[PDB]
Design a binder for this molecule. Structure first.
Ligand SMILES: [K+]
Ligand SMILES: [K+]
Ligand SMILES: [Mg+2]
Ligand SMILES: [Mg+2]
Ligand SMILES: [Mg+2]
Ligand SMILES: [Mg+2]
Ligand SMILES: [Mg+2]
Ligand SMILES: [Mg+2]
Ligand SMILES: [Mg+2]
Ligand SMILES: [Mg+2]
Ligand SMILES: [Mg+2]
Ligand SMILES: [Mg+2]
Ligand SMILES: [Mg+2]
Ligand SMILES: [Mg+2]
Ligand SMILES: [Mg+2]
Ligand SMILES: [Mg+2]
Ligand SMILES: [Mg+2]
Ligand SMILES: [Mg+2]
Ligand code: NA
Ligand code: NA
Ligand code: NA
Lengths: 51, 127, 167, 141, 71
RNA sequence: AUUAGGGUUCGAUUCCGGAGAGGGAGCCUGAGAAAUAGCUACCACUUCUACGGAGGGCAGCAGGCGCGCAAAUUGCCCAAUGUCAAAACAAAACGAUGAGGCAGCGAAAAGAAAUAGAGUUGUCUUGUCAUUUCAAUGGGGGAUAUUUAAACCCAUCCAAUAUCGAGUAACAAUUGGAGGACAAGUCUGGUGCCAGCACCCGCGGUAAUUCCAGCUCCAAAAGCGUAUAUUAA
């Protein structure tokens, strides 16, 4: 029919991105990731349970 | 760190006497441990003239100075001519213009080219 | 046009983009030596690969082949000069055993850190980038500067730096 | 089994030359039929004009109306079907719009559940279609 | 070379048979070249005879060699 | 280029060789040309004209129009490298050179490299956290100047009596992903075989690990996707 083009994208409620503090760039970002992955079965993005 | 007066010390390397062009040729390296910026060429000229017992400083030619990375030292090339006449006779004109006794710049080459191309259409008296 | 200045690449990407063990080992090397990106490890990898390929080609030859006597001597000289190999070992077979930390240990960042002029490799990096470090009175601003064994005793703060003799 | 003779080089050369034609990729690389039949004429992209917006039903077991455009290529007047590659991106495309087309990733093979299409839209009116999708640009005129 | 034909007047065709090596297959190919050679009446070569020939200035459209000896 | 080896593939393009100057063919001069910013003629196109006539050849440089997916300034200069020449330079007296060099544009590609470093109190041996303290440094602004033919870049410096500047260091990093291949969520909303995704396998039909989004996380990072070729696989 071609009339339903963009249905879901237009339907999706618009949610604003929230103002987060700025992450370090470059070598400091690697420093942060190293000090999180080490010096602290590992799950890198563990989520809370939910249904 | 102690605050002190800016000092400049001249050194000379690969010295050669050139009878053919009436001059001495050498690399000049300057050491300026506490100098704000670059030592101007005229200052090095006066220091070199005093160092080499040259009667007049205008017969010293200096060019192509490369400051070292990290500061405190610059290196260039130097020429000491037997007299002022030899300097003005043998020097490239741009270096003479640097020292203030060069020739005036000729008109723009585009205009010279255009006038030369106009004349190719003309016979004797007119062109 | 009619310009004959050479250039070449110094690094190569890994063949497998997501190996968990390789990724973890590289992140470790980045954290412990304070690197900015994986390209630095991969540059060391290319250097090591070239050296090892040369050593294999040389060892395949008979021991008294003039090419072996020349180039093996040169490569041993370079490895001893830059501290990649210990001066005790002098055979051609010890280049084959060189590892990435062996080269990474000779970076100016790691050397400045190990010399106590910096509190960490991250302090050493910014110290080098800010012209506070001189090797034999020459300011060196490159953290990947590979330090010769002879230059290790001449690494101090730069004279022009406020940590040396500067304003 | 193969010939082994020390002076049997000609047999081996002729044999390899003959059998190299059985490799489909080599034959396609060393003949003109694919390049002639290829609407892009061997190019990576081609510019065209949008004739009409059409809906192509996805193949079983999928069920969808894949939004495509019929486009006539500027260089050779060939007519193709090209996919519009995101959600609601069909509204960025109008009839007679100038459009840049690329391959679909499989070198002329049809891709996914879209039955007989090997092309997709990447630009319209000289701006990136994905750029319009993310509202990074505006459509001229 | 070996004499291949004596049909022409004062001119003969010789063959230079050789093996050509194909690097990829590490093997050889039989190949031959043919040269038209002027033959002086001082020689009477036959088909299958071996001849030594020497290069000279062009003597015709094809002839660039002269029979120097018949083995 | 790719490659353990054997190979596969690309080579219009900087050096060497050949060829051509819209197409064809002739030719004069000359040591050397079948020369084309030489001549002659025809064929196409094409410019000026007072209609008698007379002209043209960018596959040189720059720049147009077209063609295309696809490629810069109608810039400066002969300072360097060379060529020619009746010619060293200079002295009334400066040879020509879009060859060449220099700059502009230029994320083809290549090298180096920022986007922070040390802390204090408590909170929770580390490590995150709200702080609240220090120094350091470039990006940038400038200069006694330096460089350059002149400019511009790089370097040098922020007194040598006398020289600016970071705290949301807002001077705020992106591009693709998170079911498998393949690193990373059995999170939360929306949709309901639709919209869409998906190179392949597949996901979506009301509890979507796959779509549209927020959050979080992953990979590479001043880069990262996509298409088409090609090499390995
Ligand atoms: K010519
Ligand atoms: K340029
Ligand atoms: Mg070529
Ligand atoms: Mg050529
Ligand atoms: Mg010619
Ligand atoms: Mg033309
Ligand atoms: Mg001609
Ligand atoms: Mg021309
Ligand atoms: Mg009249
Ligand atoms: Mg003509
Ligand atoms: Mg042009
Ligand atoms: Mg061309
Ligand atoms: Mg041009
Ligand atoms: Mg381009
Ligand atoms: Mg040129
Ligand atoms: Mg739901
Ligand atoms: Mg859901
Ligand atoms: Mg599921
Ligand atoms: Na389905
Ligand atoms: Na998601
Ligand atoms: Na997505």
């Amino acid at each position: 029919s071609l009339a339903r083009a963009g249905k879901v994208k237009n339907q999706t409620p618009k949610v604003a991105k929230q103002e987060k503090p700025k992450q370090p760039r470059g070598r400091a970002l690697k420093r942060l990731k190293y000090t999180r992955r080490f010096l602290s079965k590992v799950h890198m993005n563990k989520q809370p349970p939910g249904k | 760190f102690q605050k002190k007066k800016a000092e400049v010390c001249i050194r000379t390397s690969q010295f050669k006497v050139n009878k053919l062009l009436n001059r001495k040729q050498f690399i000049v390296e300057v050491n300026h441990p506490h100098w704000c910026g670059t030592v101007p060429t005229q200052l090095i000229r006066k220091k070199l003239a005093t160092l080499y017992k040259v009667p007049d400083a205008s017969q010293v030619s200096l060019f192509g100075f490369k400051t070292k990375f990290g500061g405190g030292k610059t290196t260039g090339f130097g020429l000491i001519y037997d007299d002022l006449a030899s300097l003005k006779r043998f020097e490239p004109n741009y270096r003479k213009t640097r020292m203030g006794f060069g020739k005036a710049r000729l008109p723009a080459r585009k205009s010279v080219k255009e006038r030369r191309n106009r004349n190719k259409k003309l016979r004797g008296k007119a062109k | 046009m009619r310009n004959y200045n050479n250039f070449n690449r110094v690094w190569k990407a890994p063949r497998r983009p997501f190996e968990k063990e390789r990724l973890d080992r590289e992140m470790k090397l980045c954290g412990q030596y304070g690197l900015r990106c994986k390209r630095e490890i991969w540059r060391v990898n290319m250097t090591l690969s070239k050296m090892r390929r040369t050593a294999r080609l040389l060892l395949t030859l008979p021991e008294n082949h003039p090419r072996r006597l020349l180039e093996g001597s040169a490569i041993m000289r370079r490895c001893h000069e830059y501290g990649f190999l210990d001066e005790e070992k002098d055979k051609l077979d010890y280049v084959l055993s060189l590892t990435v930390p062996d080269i990474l240990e000779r970076r100016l960042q790691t050397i400045v850190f190990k010399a106590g002029l910096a509190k960490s490799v991250h302090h050493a990096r910014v110290l080098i980038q800010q012209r506070h470090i001189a090797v034999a009175k020459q300011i060196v601003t490159i953290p990947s500067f590979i330090v010769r064994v002879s230059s290790e005793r001449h690494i101090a703060f730069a004279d022009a730096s406020p940590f040396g003799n500067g304003r | 089994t193969k010939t082994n003779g020390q002076n049997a080089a000609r047999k081996l050369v002729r044999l390899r030359c003959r059998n190299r034609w059985a490799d489909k990729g080599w034959k396609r690389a060393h003949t003109f039929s694919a390049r002639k039949a290829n609407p892009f004429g061997g190019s990576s992209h081609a510019k065209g004009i949008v004739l009409e917006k059409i809906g192509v039903g996805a193949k079983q077991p999928n069920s969808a109306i894949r939004k495509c455009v019929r486009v006539q290529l500027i260089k050779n007047d060939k007519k193709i079907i090209a996919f519009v590659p995101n959600d609601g991106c069909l509204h960025f495309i109008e009839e007679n719009d100038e459009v840049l087309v690329s391959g679909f990733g499989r070198s002329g093979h049809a891709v996914g559940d879209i039955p007989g299409v090997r092309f997709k839209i990447v630009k319209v009116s000289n701006v990136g279609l994905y750029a319009l999708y993310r509202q990074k640009k505006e459509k001229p005129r | 070379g070996v004499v291949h034909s004596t049909k022409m007047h004062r001119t003969i065709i010789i063959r230079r048979n050789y093996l050509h090596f194909i690097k990829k297959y590490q093997r050889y190919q039989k190949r031959h070249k043919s040269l038209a050679v002027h033959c002086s009446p001082a020689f009477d070569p036959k088909q299958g005879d071996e001849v030594v020939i020497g290069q000279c200035r062009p003597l015709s459209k094809t002839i660039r060699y002269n029979v120097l000896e018949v083995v």
